[PDB]
Amino acid sequence: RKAVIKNADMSEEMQQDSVECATQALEKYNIEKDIAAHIKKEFDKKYNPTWHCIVGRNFGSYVTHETKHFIYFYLGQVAILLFKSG
Amino acid sequence: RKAVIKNADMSEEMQQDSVECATQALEKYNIEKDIAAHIKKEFDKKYNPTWHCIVGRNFGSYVTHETKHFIYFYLGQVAILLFKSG
Amino acid sequence: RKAVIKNADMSEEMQQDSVECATQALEKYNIEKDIAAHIKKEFDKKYNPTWHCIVGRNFGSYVTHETKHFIYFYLGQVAILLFKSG
Amino acid sequence: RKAVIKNADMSEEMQQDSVECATQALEKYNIEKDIAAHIKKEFDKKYNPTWHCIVGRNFGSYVTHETKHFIYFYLGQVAILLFKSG
Amino acid sequence: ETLWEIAKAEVEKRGINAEIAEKFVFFIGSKNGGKTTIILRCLDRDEPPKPTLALEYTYGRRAKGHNTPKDIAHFWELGGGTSLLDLISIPITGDTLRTFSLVLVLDLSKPNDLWPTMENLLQATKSHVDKVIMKLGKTNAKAVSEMRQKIWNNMPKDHPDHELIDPFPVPLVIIGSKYDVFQDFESEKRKVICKTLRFVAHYYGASLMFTSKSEALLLKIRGVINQLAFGIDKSKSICVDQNKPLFITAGLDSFGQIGSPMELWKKVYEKLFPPKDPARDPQYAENEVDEMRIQKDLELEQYKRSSSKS
Amino acid sequence: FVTEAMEVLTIMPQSVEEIGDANLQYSKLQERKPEILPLFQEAEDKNRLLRTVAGGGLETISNLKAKWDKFELXXXXXXXXXXXXXXXXXXXXXXX
Amino acid sequence: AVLHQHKEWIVIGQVDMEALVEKHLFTVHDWEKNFKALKIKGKEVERLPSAVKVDCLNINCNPVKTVIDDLIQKXXXXXXXXXXXXXXXXXXXXXX
Amino acid sequence: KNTKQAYVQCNEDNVERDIQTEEIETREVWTQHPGESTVVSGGTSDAVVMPK
């Protein structure tokens, strides 16, 4: 579950929170639906809605995000996309 | 390939366009990010922004969507999540 | 020789085809690894990858399979396990 | 339960872990299905799913694995096939 | 005494219309016309299509949502001018005509070879269903009167019921097949073909639909005639103007609009296209053919002597 | 439980003198749900077996789970909203 | 045809009968007619073949024989139950 | 605004199966070419004499 951030448009504090939050989610939950749900909810609470989270091993996406609220990173072999929109 | 709809909160017309658009995207593109991009762009044009699309073989998501703008379906073994938010 | 299906979570068409394919494999090959290889390869071609096949007289297994793609049957005294996963 | 590894595409640390895990499995469980099940579950927990295990004295297989996650070895007269796929 | 009369009265009274008595449908078409693919997809199967047909049987199952009543639908199909009455006459009996309907599928591949094909098949089936209404000696013909009076007053919803241009006492829906080739015909031919399809729709009072992916009416209308299996009529507008898609709601297809009888038929018919050794004698063998001859005769003669009433 | 709770919760965040009793039902629902909510996990724990033996014929269970997800998240959201609104309205209207 | 005969020979709905027997049955003459016919139906169901063989298909009808036998047995029991009720009740009413 | 929360899981189900083959029944048996009337045996009525 080593963390490597590939791309972000996000403050350093939110970037760190994303990694730590996703790391906790990945330790606790086995199924991506639950990992994503954990991560999303923590951001809605702390950084206001509306957050979206996608977690997985094989996907591509094309999304629209709010400036300064985007990160894409891996934990081991699993990619996490975390951003605000709406 | 064969379209199988698992979830939808969406009008019948938009559901059919989701499949048709993904079908063309999957035929035209090999890379997931480009397949997703094709699908998203087509919806923004016909049904107004802001749409988001994720296409892949292995992922989970937890997202917030606009009412009547959510579908999840497969084309063969490839899953497509298509929704509006913003 | 006589095919006896003990377990299956599989359509009737794939069930009969699995037996037919294993029957030909057993007629053509003596070595289990080669019998399995014949059965596996034929299924990947007809029903898309990814199949796995185990052939033998003495074993236990614990596997995870896709829904509607699992069969376990005998040809005489030889057991054949065939399923999709991946 | 002397171990002899015939083929592996696996790190050395996981190779040793597999042998020790299977060795304990045979000490603890009498029936191949339960031996296989124990071994499979231990890898899903430590090395992520989806693992599959075959345990027995008489079988052949033809399978597809993810790179760096395959081992085939004996413990005495009992063969154990352990790989990740899906 | 009265205990059995009541027990009998209720099991007899109820049980016609868990699920109500199911209907079944026969598919008129041509050989390798793509009909099998449509049927297998409508039944939600993944099976490869078979080109040939020899009175094939298949079925499907639907649920309702409050439970699974096991709504079973039976299907029969036959393609091409092969053993038409020998096979069509078998699954169709007057006693079950009420629950029997027809569907016609048109292979757009060869409209020229198709018109004499579908005509002969339609004549064979129409003649049969027309007779069985009383061929059985059905003295209690009230059902026969109901069937003809209902069918022949469902299409002329608004148009004056001047005449029954072609008495057709069974429901029909018409669909094409493999329309992907239709766009490749000459524009003049596509128009005359479209008129021909619409013409037949009028005579039989059968709605018409296109074949595509977004065109969900194809599955639905089949369900409609198949005992509402996939919904209700859902009447849409006719597409006589666009002529790009094909669609007709039976009842709105007046000749004056779709053609714009014999004269209209003559026009499209003539314009589109008017030109519409097992013996093994030179061979010799002694033991092979003698023994086969003997065995052939002995078995066949025994089967004839069985005097089956079939 | 979650369905009926949502219906009454939907009228609690308002500041209206006709329902100046509904705060009591609000507290009750908060105190009750810790006992009712585990039914969902218990259903899943048993589901592990039903899935296998019933051949996947669990359409009713799946549909209900999906409905619960909505009601719980929706219900939970309403509860947060009602509490917040009641707390906000109480501060807002006492002052007024 | 035979599938219907199995449903027609012996009614399988078998609606409740307690009201009918308690209201218009159990006089000396009328009851002997009803009960002899019941015993006869018992003799009949004992002859329902356990299977029917045709040129292609074999249908097992042993489960049918069992149920239709129980159904006849049930009517006699119901009649016995009803008789033991009417006799008890009428003396009490008239005592009142 | 009227929005809804939802989620999807590609791996909608993961069905596990256990498989076990049967055992083979074997016995130990003696044989010998040179010997007594009873060749080999697995590891008092005497009504046998009466007929003669």
Residue in the block written with tokens 């590891």: H43
Question: What chains are in contact with D, requiring at least 3 Cβ pairs below 8 Å?
Answer: C, H
Do D61 and C51 meet the contact criterion of CB atoms below 8 Å apart?
A: no
The pairing of beta strand B78-84 with beta strand B3-10: unpaired
Q: Where are the alpha helices (DSSP H) in chain D?
A: 12-28, 32-47
- Which amino acid is residue F93, in one-letter code? X
For residue B24, the Cα-to-chain-centroid distance in whole angstroms is 11
Do E8 and E59 meet the contact criterion of CB atoms below 8 Å apart?
A: no
For residue D76, the Cα-to-chain-centroid distance in whole angstroms is 14
H2 touches chain B (CB under 8 A): yes
Of G40, G42, G43, the closest CA to residue G70 belongs to G42
Do A31 and H13 meet the contact criterion of CB atoms below 8 Å apart?
A: no
Do D48 and D28 meet the contact criterion of CB atoms below 8 Å apart?
A: no
Contacts of B61 in chain A (CB under 8 A): 32-33, 36, 52-56
Kindly report the nearest CA distance between residue H18 and chain D, in angstroms.
6
Of E210, H10, C11, the closest CA to residue A35 belongs to H10
Interface contact A58-B62, CB threshold 8 A? no
E48 touches chain B (CB under 8 A): no
Q: Is the dihedral of CA A13, A19, A22, A23 positive or negative?
A: negative
Of E208, E221, E229, the closest CA to residue E59 belongs to E229
Long-range interactions of F50-58: CB distance < 8 A, separation 24+: F51/H13, F51/H15, F52/H15, F55/C9, F56/C9, F56/C67, F56/H13, F56/H15
Cα distances (Å, whole numbers) of residue B60 to A32, A54, B26, E51: 5, 6, 20, 42
Do B47 and B70 meet the contact criterion of CB atoms below 8 Å apart?
A: no
Q: Is H32 helix (H, G, I), strand (E, B) or coil?
A: coil
Do B8 and B70 meet the contact criterion of CB atoms below 8 Å apart?
A: yes
Of E200, E201, E177, E197, the closest CA to residue E249 belongs to E201
Residue E253 sits at the vertex; the CA angle it makes with E251 and E257, to the nearest 5 degrees, is 145
Round to whole Å and give the CA distance between G93 and G84. 15
Please enumerate in sequence order all residues whose Cβ is within 8 A of that of F62, keeping only pairs 6 or more positions apart, or say none.
Answer: none
**What count of Cα atoms within 13 Å lies in the side-chain half-sphere of residue E211?**
22
Do E172 and E136 meet the contact criterion of CB atoms below 8 Å apart?
A: no
Domain extents for chain D?
Answer: 1-86
Interface contact H10-A36, CB threshold 8 A? no
CB atoms within 10 A of CB A52: 27
Residue in the block written with tokens 């009433």: E309
C11 touches chain E (CB under 8 A): yes
Q: Kind and range of the H or E element at E200? A: helix E187-204
How many CB contacts within 8 angstroms connect chain F with chain H?
Answer: 7
Q: Provide the token pair at F37.
A: 């909510």
Eight-class DSSP state of E99 = G
Kindly report the nearest CA distance between residue B13 and chain A, in angstroms.
22
The residue of chain D with its CA nearest to that of H10 is D86
E46 touches chain C (CB under 8 A): yes
The residue of chain G with its CA nearest to that of E14 is G13
Q: Which of F52, F56, F73 has the CB atom closest to H5's CB atom? A: F73
The residue of chain C with its CA nearest to that of E47 is C13
Round to whole Å and give the CA distance between G19 and G23. 6
Radius of gyration of chain B measured on its C-alpha atoms: 11
E26 — phi, psi (to 5°)? -115, 140
Interface contact B20-E213, CB threshold 8 A? yes
Of E203, E152, E143, E213, the closest CA to residue E180 belongs to E213
Round to whole Å and give the CA distance between E120 and E130. 15
Kindly report the nearest CA distance between residue H11 and chain B, in angstroms.
7
H8 touches chain A (CB under 8 A): yes
Do B57 and B81 meet the contact criterion of CB atoms below 8 Å apart?
A: no
Which of B55, B59, B75, B77 to mutate against chain H (most H CBs within 10 Å)? B59
- Which amino acid is residue H27, in one-letter code? R
User: In chain B, what is the greatest distance between 2 CA atoms, to the nearest angstrom?
Assistant: 31
Q: Which of H1, H3, H9 has the CB atom closest to A32's CB atom? A: H9
Interface contact C61-H13, CB threshold 8 A? no
Which runs of E-coded beta strand occur in H1-52?
3-9, 15-20
How many CB contacts within 8 angstroms connect chain C with chain F?
Answer: 3
Interface contact B52-A58, CB threshold 8 A? no
Residue D27 sits at the vertex; the CA angle it makes with D24 and D32, to the nearest 5 degrees, is 95
CB atoms within 10 A of CB H37: 4
Interface contact H20-D33, CB threshold 8 A? yes
* Resolution of the coordinates, Å: 3.9
F57 touches chain H (CB under 8 A): no
**Paired strand residues for E71:** E62
Round to whole Å and give the CA distance between A43 and A54. 13
Interface contact E214-B16, CB threshold 8 A? yes
Round to whole Å and give the CA distance between E147 and E130. 11
Do C40 and D62 meet the contact criterion of CB atoms below 8 Å apart?
A: yes
Cα distances (Å, whole numbers) of residue B35 to A19, B14, B56, B60: 28, 18, 9, 18
Which of H15, H16, H18 to mutate against chain C (most C CBs within 10 Å)? H15
Cα distances (Å, whole numbers) of residue F91 to F84, F85, F87: 11, 10, 6
Q: Kind and range of the H or E element at B36? A: helix B32-47
Round to whole Å and give the CA distance between H23 and C60. 11
Interface contact A62-B31, CB threshold 8 A? no
The residue of chain D with its CA nearest to that of C62 is D37
The region, left, alpha or beta by phi > 0 then psi within -120 to 50, assigned to residue G93 is alpha
Q: Kind and range of the H or E element at E77? A: strand E71-79
A66 — phi, psi (to 5°)? -70, 140
Do E111 and E176 meet the contact criterion of CB atoms below 8 Å apart?
A: no
E9 touches chain G (CB under 8 A): no
The residue of chain A with its CA nearest to that of H6 is A37
The DSSP-derived string for chain A is --EEEEEEEE-HHHHHHHHHHHHHHHHH-SSHHHHHHHHHHHHHHHH-S-EEEEEEEEEEEE----TTEEEEEEETTEEEEEEE--
Contacts of H4 in chain F (CB under 8 A): 70
Residue B11 sits at the vertex; the CA angle it makes with B10 and B15, to the nearest 5 degrees, is 75
Which method, experimentally, gave rise to this model? Answer: cryo-EM
Q: What CATH number has the domain spanning A1-86?
A: 3.30.740.10
Q: Kind and range of the H or E element at C39? A: helix C32-47
Do C8 and C65 meet the contact criterion of CB atoms below 8 Å apart?
A: no
Interface contact H14-D32, CB threshold 8 A? no
Round to whole Å and give the CA distance between A45 and A32. 20
Round to whole Å and give the CA distance between G6 and F30. 59
Kindly report the nearest CA distance between residue D50 and chain H, in angstroms.
9
Round to whole Å and give the CA distance between E198 and E240. 9
Helices B12-28 and B32-47, axial angle in degrees (round to 10): 140
Round to whole Å and give the CA distance between E125 and E197. 19
